[PDB]
């Protein structure tokens, strides 16, 4: 699968649920899994969002440092879903704060991080097909 396509479709879905149209089985599974993740932990995402202090100056370092912490002890499919949801939070905050250009940057950062830092783990653990298999019963 193309990680760029997965990121772009995921970001567009998350923004469209907020009423913002951003120009840009795996997709459906990730969408449902991220929605389920979000609804379980709204209190934590709200605190995360309030502390984000998103500006074009801080956005990249904020993303990089959070993702580094997220994978400090390794990777699992839950961490992958959280990676997408955290990127989604930054995208939603971007448009809410009239910094919509940052969405393109976040999509780039997510795509390149997947391809550089997560591709080996994903393939080693059966590819995106394994994620679809794992979460299928929850759909």
């Amino acid at each position: 699968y193309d990680n760029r396509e997965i990121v772009m479709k995921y970001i567009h879905y998350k923004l469209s649920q907020r009423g913002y149209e951003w120009d840009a089985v795996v997709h459906l599974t990730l969408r449902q899994a991220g929605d389920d993740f979000s609804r379980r932990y709204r209190r934590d995402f709200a605190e995360m969002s309030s502390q984000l202090h998103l500006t074009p100056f801080t956005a990249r370092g904020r993303f990089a440092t959070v993702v580094e912490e997220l994978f400090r002890d390794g990777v699992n499919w839950g961490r992958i879903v959280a990676f997408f949801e955290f990127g989604g939070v930054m995208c939603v905050e971007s448009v809410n704060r009239e910094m919509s250009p940052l969405v393109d940057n976040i999509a780039l950062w997510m795509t390149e991080y997947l391809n550089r830092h997560l591709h080996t783990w994903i393939q080693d653990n059966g590819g995106w097909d394994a994620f679809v298999e794992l979460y299928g019963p929850s759909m």
């Binding site: 959070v66 699992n76 879903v81 959280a82 929850s138």
Partner: peptide, 21 residues
């Protein structure tokens, strides 16, 4: 340190989530 806190909670939530599959 903001990112350490965020990342720590995302890991906790991630691990709870995946362990419930």
């Amino acid at each position: 340190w903001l990112a350490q806190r965020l990342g720590r909670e995302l890991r906790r939530l991630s691990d709870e989530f995946v362990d419930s599959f």
